[PDB]
Amino acid sequence: AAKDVKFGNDARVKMLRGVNVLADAVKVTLGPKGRNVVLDKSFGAPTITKDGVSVAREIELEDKFENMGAQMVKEVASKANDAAGDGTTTATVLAQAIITEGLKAVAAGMNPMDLKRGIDKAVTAAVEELKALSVPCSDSKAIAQVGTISANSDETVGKLIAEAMDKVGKEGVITVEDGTGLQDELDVVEGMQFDRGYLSPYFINKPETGAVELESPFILLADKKISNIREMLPVLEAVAKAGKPLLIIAEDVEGEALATLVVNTMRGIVKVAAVKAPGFGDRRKAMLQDIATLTGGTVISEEIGMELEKATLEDLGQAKRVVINKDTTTIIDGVGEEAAIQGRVAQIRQQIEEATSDYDREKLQERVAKLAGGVAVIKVGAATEVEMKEKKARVEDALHATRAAVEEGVVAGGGVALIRVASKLADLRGQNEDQNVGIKVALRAMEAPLRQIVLNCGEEPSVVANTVKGGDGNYGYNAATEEYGNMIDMGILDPTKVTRSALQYAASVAGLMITTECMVTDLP
Amino acid sequence: AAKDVKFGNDARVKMLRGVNVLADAVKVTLGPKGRNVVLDKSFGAPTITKDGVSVAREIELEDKFENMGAQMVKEVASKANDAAGDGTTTATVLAQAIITEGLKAVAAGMNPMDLKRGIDKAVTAAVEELKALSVPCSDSKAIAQVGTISANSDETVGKLIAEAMDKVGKEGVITVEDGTGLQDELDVVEGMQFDRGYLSPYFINKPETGAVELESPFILLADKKISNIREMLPVLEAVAKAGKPLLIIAEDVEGEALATLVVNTMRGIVKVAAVKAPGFGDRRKAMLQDIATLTGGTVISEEIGMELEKATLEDLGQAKRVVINKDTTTIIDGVGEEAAIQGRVAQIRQQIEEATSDYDREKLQERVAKLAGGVAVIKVGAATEVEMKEKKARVEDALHATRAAVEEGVVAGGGVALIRVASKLADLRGQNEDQNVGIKVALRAMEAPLRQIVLNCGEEPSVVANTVKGGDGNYGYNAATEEYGNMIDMGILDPTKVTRSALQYAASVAGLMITTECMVTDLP
Amino acid sequence: AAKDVKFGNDARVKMLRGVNVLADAVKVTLGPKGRNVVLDKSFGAPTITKDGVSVAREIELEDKFENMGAQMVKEVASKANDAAGDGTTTATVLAQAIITEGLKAVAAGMNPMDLKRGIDKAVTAAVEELKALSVPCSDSKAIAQVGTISANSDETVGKLIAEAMDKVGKEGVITVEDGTGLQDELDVVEGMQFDRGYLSPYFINKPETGAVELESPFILLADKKISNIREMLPVLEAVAKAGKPLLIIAEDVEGEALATLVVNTMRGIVKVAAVKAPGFGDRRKAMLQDIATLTGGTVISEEIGMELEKATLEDLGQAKRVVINKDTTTIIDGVGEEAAIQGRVAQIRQQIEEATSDYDREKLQERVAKLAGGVAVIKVGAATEVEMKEKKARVEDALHATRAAVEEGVVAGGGVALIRVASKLADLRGQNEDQNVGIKVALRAMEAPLRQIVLNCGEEPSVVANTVKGGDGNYGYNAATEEYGNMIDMGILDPTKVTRSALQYAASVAGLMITTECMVTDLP
Amino acid sequence: DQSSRYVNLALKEEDLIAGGEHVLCAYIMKPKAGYGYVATAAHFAAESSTGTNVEVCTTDDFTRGVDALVYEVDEARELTKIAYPVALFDRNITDGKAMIASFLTLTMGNNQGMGDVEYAKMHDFYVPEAYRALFDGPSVNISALWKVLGRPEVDGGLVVGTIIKPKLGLRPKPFAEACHAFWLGGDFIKNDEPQGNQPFAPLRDTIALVADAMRRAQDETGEAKLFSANIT
């Protein structure tokens, strides 16, 4: 299909209009007095969102030269959400500010490559100054603060998240999903849990609980289907001689063996339950080895040449209690050993280094959480689906933001950290005059986040901006209260990881865009 | 495909134009002097209906930006129906009143989030007073009133449903289905009944009614097909020795055995009947276990290591009577123990609490009903099909309204409860003056239901709204008779659950929409 | 489809308009102050590029005759990219320069064939002068400049490539792939390695490393699937008697043999591991012969009629050490010998000379590199995909330019080498005056690259072109710092092969273009 | 293409199978390395239906009814079970039965042109209990061959056939004679896969000559016989 080509300012002008449309859409989500954007999805009810990247993803313009601009800055919002979850709008507002100044600098006739080298030098220094400003975040109050701020001033979410991370500990996994009540709820899972229930109702010994509970059971770990009672007879006999109950963990229990076990348990000869193994394939094998390690048991498998006809009470693991339901199994206080667990955890943690896939890494993180911590579910309480999907997205940011604080620290929020560092680099210089203006582009555009935060209040940005730059240290303006104060004592905090990430990626894409001289696209 | 975007007042106006089109389509159905709407359908007669939400589902505008407005308020109209049955139009009117006043207040320049928080506070305070205003409903007369009003002043429906609830008792299940005559008719089914008949006509022993009847029969509950008569011979021998008749319930009876029973029954060797088991899957075993519990029998089944050849007269259940027809079976006074039956009821009642699926809960509710309560069917009489669907939709509402009254009480209808609570909250205040406008916005809109009820009569609405506020307590305006009085004495009562629900879901959706600043959708 | 045809000057003018569109898109990329071109790709994000041919491939015009102009000179970009991989923009500019002046000569009434012959004579002699100017490049410092220069004045890629070529040596292979960090990182592989891992985890004897280590191991190279361990017993018996570990390389090991080895390894009787042979098809057999040769082993195959039951430790290869991972196998110091390996290398060297496909030539160079050198991987670091995909293409530019320089030498960059040859030919004359003009067109056009390099800086081209022609030797204009000096002393170097390439291909196409007298194409 | 909407694991296999809502195909599917499995299985479902490649539009964007869906997926067992809308398999005009060209197009053909599916071997499928009677369906089969052979229509068993000895290069009338000889034996034969109109033994003469050989063999045996002409 034949191409269309444009040169110079007739090209760059088309480019700038595109970026401005997308950025102008995104800006309005910024800050605590921001407003929501409504996104059309034809499949159902429209979705209202405050999530910057969700708005950015949909924008794509009719006029092909205009469309190209939006498609570029869409990259920055995507990565910042991928890198650290929160921060997406701030990275966008930074990226638009630098672009608009860059076209300003190019029109003055600077060589665009020296401008790029200038920008890249200013960012390199600014990241080092941010690392110097960062201070540790280390307690529930600081964590509750950053949670509140990321939640858009919903103290309940901040409080709730501090409790959840306290209960499961740093190795614990926290998740959020759609609730049913009109108010939030926190469920914490402890010990080991997996999504497999009893294979028949007759095992149920506490029908009031609707569940199976066994005290001091043996646990058998069969790496294959169970097919005929003949494979198990000496185990049940050995177990029956010991008199303690038994839990079968196996890939399956076929009906005749199962029915024979069901018969024997109800008639009280020996007390037994059977569950399918969780997961599948190699991860099943690992998890079976994990439960064996946790229980101190042994994985019975033919690849090592073991036989169920030769299995003994030394091969079966133990736990103080197990509880199993229609759909669920839990093992309480497995009789493993600490040195083995940390070695097994160390293996998985090394595998976490090897897990290039983030989802698989999350599964590895879940596995170590099962061995060494807990798992929690936050249930989001809201009256309506169009609010469920709004509230949920804010809790998502609060979880990522609270996570981001603990490993890297926090800085004064409201952009004042990013204002302060800009004052320190004022002595920075380039090799040539073009690089000096390129440096100055960065120091000017870094004000743009605070300016937009204030502008959404309807305040006069330059009046506040002038007074904040007149301030010292963490002195800043609070747009919630519409008054100045100490951001640390006022509890307005940003994770250093998100603020640092929002600058680095923004300068990457903008540093290219100001150098564009030609675009080629298909005739409409 | 290329998006289109709009901002601020240009977007918000287009949004408001949408909501009002859907609201006016619904508005006309409200109250006792409301009027019907005609809904097009592509494949049949036009559906005459009064149901508000049924109109609300069909509305869909041509202009995408208008369409987004309608497609959102449809959500509150739907959910209020799903939560409570009746109470759709009221929720739609409240939502449209607040959105106009909220967007009206936004033009003055107030921050939308302080409005949202202001509305949310007012609704939260209002629910507490409504929970205080609610009074118990218990006697058949009070139930008859709420039925009548929900039926739109068709007293016959209130009388009929009041008797239906009285007969089946509060555990019972009441349903409505198409009749054939002009008259509404109530059928009550008692004991146990299920939709399986004789497996062959030749069992018929009362052809003067096409019926099988047996007295003090033994009942066999066979969990699998009957396929070889040698399965039955030892039981049939023992049954023949007892001489009492036998009912077989089985997965199937194959032709050899079935026909051989036909021979032995026709020739009078043994009084026998056989029926297919009700349903399939685990519900069959469960239902069979229920019949076993009710009859004191045992489910002859392989899983318990039992064989039909080993079953005995001690295992067969008994009941005073059974009757089976071409399509239906009923069992009268099973010999099961009340304590055992009560325990089984407690099991299934506990399942009702754990059953999140509402369809499963009816299935569970029918089984506790058929074990412990009446089953009732109301047959709606109407002269023609387009009248049938209309009449049926009003009867359907009386069930939900009468049910809703029993568990949560009633308050003075006619919007008066909303007027009275509005007078109590006048002292409420927020954190800031924009929240004060947000509190007052909600307390303004609660008049909107009463004004429409009067305006649909053609009476001057703001006059009646003034006089109702002049009175106190349950003083109100009877729009059906154009006079003031006590709403309790005229019986104009509404269930608390429906009034409280309409307010909450309206405030939830309306409070979000007024924060809208941008919309993105496809070009036409 | 009915065609449209044109004759004479109307054809040439439309054709000329075509070329200028494709030329003008590429020209703006030239030189150190060139600018980026943005390429639309609807199936993903648009591409930001400085690579000439990557732009040239995308151009296709709506006007069928203008389409012919771009489509003709596009041949020059494709051939230059295949022959040398750098200089394509330079080759395009020369082609466009000759075409414009050639058509000018045709408009003066010159016979076109004498221009063709006259051009061809001048270019033939000009290449002879380039053979005189080239000087050998043979040290780490020289190579680092041509890398840096071709990289567009980035020393880090030059410094990195200078290390990589030193470590892998003359016969080594170097590759570039997407990294994940911001910094560039160089990996070097010693010895022979291939991408096959352990067939089971149970071979792992370093569980924390996830790896197998064996010392002075025997290595078995079975050219078939190992089915039954009864096949292995006499070899394994000899290894067990020796007590040294054994590495199995086979086309497969089936579970019973594999599992028996897994069993035998867990109980520690013999240390063994098994891996798939690398590759597939006859190259797999070749690599097995290569591994045998490097290890001093012998390939066992039923094609020669040798059998595992007859194999012996004299047939098995040996090496000092081996390491295998989840995905990778490497051999350390095989017991092969220099004479046998070199003879095998000579066979492959004959194959490389025989290889008609560069893919085969690559597949051949890899094995001699594994046999006699090594492999290096440069992982490009960048913050974003568009910069990453941009960055990699500049690393590629340096990697072929550095290669091209080593086999042909270097000459002063900035086109000044072409200027200096454009003076030496001024005495050349042809058989007739038309051929004399044909010489003049070529000698005039060789100034075009320098003029474009200057023009992109915004300087007056003919002033610089005059001052360079007023100089002598390598005296030229340093466009990066806008000063004259010795380019060899400034380190501004082009590989002689690219300049000699850019001429010959450009003159080949342009010398045909101007003899066009008619065009035939389908009607629009 | 795409995975969004194409992941629909909420679809119950009971209503899909016993409700007949979809044709249900179980694939042992493995992606290429590094691809998301569920995305690949869902992306493979898109190739197994609408295609939906780069973009879909109907003058106003979107297309959402034709999609075949993954309804069970499990990466580590390589399982990819895809449920197909019955509308995918358009009815043949000769019989109202769905064109199997679609089914292959949507399982083991154009849909397999997906490259990040390394393989998707279907181990099983289901077809809706009712609409199954309106799958393309073998209106002739072994049971009708029994009927023309004069066997009972129930358990008429083995319709004996051969690959003609010595396979290729046997000229049409020697091939027909080998069919005749075989049909002095058993019941059924096919042409070989190269024995279309290929010049060593084209179809028309071979089938004419083979048909004569069948009648001759029938007349010389008193029992019916069959030939399978390579129409490919």
Ligand SMILES: Nc1ncnc2c1ncn2[C@@H]1O[C@H](COP(=O)(O)OP(=O)(O)O)[C@@H](O)[C@H]1O
């Ligand atoms: N009370 C407040 N006063 C001033 N600024 C605030 C306040 N609360 C939050 N902010 C600022 O809002 C900015 C926007 O962050 P956020 O709302 O997460 O959007 P995003 O992270 O997508 O840009 C943050 O830099 C944060 O410091």
Ligand SMILES: Nc1ncnc2c1ncn2[C@@H]1O[C@H](COP(=O)(O)OP(=O)(O)O)[C@@H](O)[C@H]1O
């Ligand atoms: N005679 C009456 N006088 C005043 N209000 C009435 C009378 N009858 C019904 N209403 C009121 O009409 C309102 C709507 O009832 P209904 O039409 O059933 O709601 P919906 O249309 O949502 O089903 C209720 O507030 C109810 O109390």
Ligand SMILES: Nc1ncnc2c1ncn2[C@@H]1O[C@H](COP(=O)(O)OP(=O)(O)O)[C@@H](O)[C@H]1O
């Ligand atoms: N600092 C410099 N001064 C003068 N000429 C330069 C300089 N850097 C590069 N060049 C010239 O630019 C050309 C290479 O630019 P490049 O983008 O690689 O074009 P091409 O794609 O044709 O190789 C060469 O002719 C080289 O001599």
Ligand SMILES: [Mg+2]
């Ligand atoms: Mg109502």
Ligand SMILES: [Mg+2]
């Ligand atoms: Mg180049």
